Design a protein around this nucleic acid. Structure first.
Ligand code: CA
Length: 314
DNA sequence: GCGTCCAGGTCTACC
DNA sequence: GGTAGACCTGGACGC
């Protein structure tokens, strides 16, 4: 009863709600879609993970988002803590207004948007976002998820345990920059990305001026930010865009991976015009990004998140 | 069963 | 400057 992952029906007095209609948010379409790799549906329709340095379980009804926190006597989430959740899901942004606009200027989006409502963008921590996506290149979401979990268990702060799952906070720069981290990560199956994680932690700490350098990027311009990130090992045009869009508040950033290329080709009959090659290249990828930006506008990256999520369901 | 594919790409030797 | 290839892993086919 007081053990294991909570459920809305099993410990009612431990949940607090936040007004939020399904049309504004669909947990099942956001949490496992490759934005954040730290959420698990431990129980049907209930997603658990670390949010703002503590564990949470989230589940929704038709007009409500139910939340519960595991911190020392058990109690319902406080208003201050609930605000942590609203900020994570950027709930002040009305998804209905965005869908309307995108739908109005792109009939294909309108068709897809009718079946995939509630796909919004999470506002993530720069450090977690940087290393999680460094782990995502040339990989699949299922594998990435495992790697990130083993990376946190091995180098992140131990939080609390529910059933047989021990939650860990995301590793710090100092820890990822530690001795023999690469070798450890390789044994944890991160492949060549193990070097990228170690190498990027050190560059940030020993060459770019630590954490402050990364955090300052949120006030910098998309152009500047993306430019700054490409310096880090394991970070290319796509990873940089992922971070700008999901962790640095650059809503116009559009990541271009294999999924978005296929979408461009079959759903818009798109082809490079300024670019030389007829396939993916640093030049064509950059062009595809501008194409999407001129199609959807300022929040083009968010529209991208919708089609990407929808393309995963196939 | 085994070899080839691929997945939210990067990085590098080279024409 | 604008490419071809190599690359850790492991669930997916194709045969
Ligand atoms: Ca590929």
């Amino acid at each position: 009863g007081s053990e294991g992952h909570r459920t809305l029906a099993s410990t009612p007095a431990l949940w607090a709600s936040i007004p939020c209609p399904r049309s504004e948010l669909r947990l099942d379409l956001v949490l496992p879609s490759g934005q954040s790799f730290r959420w698990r549906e431990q129980s049907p329709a209930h997603w658990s993970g670390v949010l703002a340095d503590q564990v949470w379980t989230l589940t929704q009804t038709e007009e409500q988002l139910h939340c519960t926190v595991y911190r020392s006597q058990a109690s319902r989430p406080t208003p201050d803590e609930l605000e942590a959740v609203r900020k994570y899901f950027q709930l002040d942004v009305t998804l209905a207004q965005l869908y309307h606009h995108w739908g109005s200027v792109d009939s294909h989006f309108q068709e897809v948007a009718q079946k995939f409502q509630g796909v919004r963008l999470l506002r993530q921590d720069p450090i977690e976002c940087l290393f999680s996506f460094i782990c995502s290149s040339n990989n699949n979401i299922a594998r990435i998820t495992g790697m990130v979990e083993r990376l946190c268990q091995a180098f992140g702060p131990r939080l609390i345990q529910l059933d047989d799952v021990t939650y860990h906070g995301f590793p710090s720069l100092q820890a990822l920059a530690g001795p023999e981290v690469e070798a450890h990560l390789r044994k944890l199956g991160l492949g060549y990305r193990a070097r990228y994680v170690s190498a990027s932690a050190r560059a940030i700490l020993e060459e770019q001026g630590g954490l402050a350098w990364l955090q300052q990027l949120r006030e910098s311009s998309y152009e500047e930010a993306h430019k700054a990130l490409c310096i880090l090992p394991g970070v290319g045009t796509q990873v940089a865009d992922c971070i700008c869009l999901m962790a640095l508040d650059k809503p116009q950033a559009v990541p271009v991976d294999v999924h978005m290329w296929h979408i461009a080709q079959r759903d818009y009959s798109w082809h490079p015009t300024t670019s030389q090659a007829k396939g993916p290249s640093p030049q064509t990828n950059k062009e595809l990004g501008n194409f999407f930006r001129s199609l959807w506008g300022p929040y083009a990256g968010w529209a991208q998140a919708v089609l990407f999520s929808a393309d995963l369901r196939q």
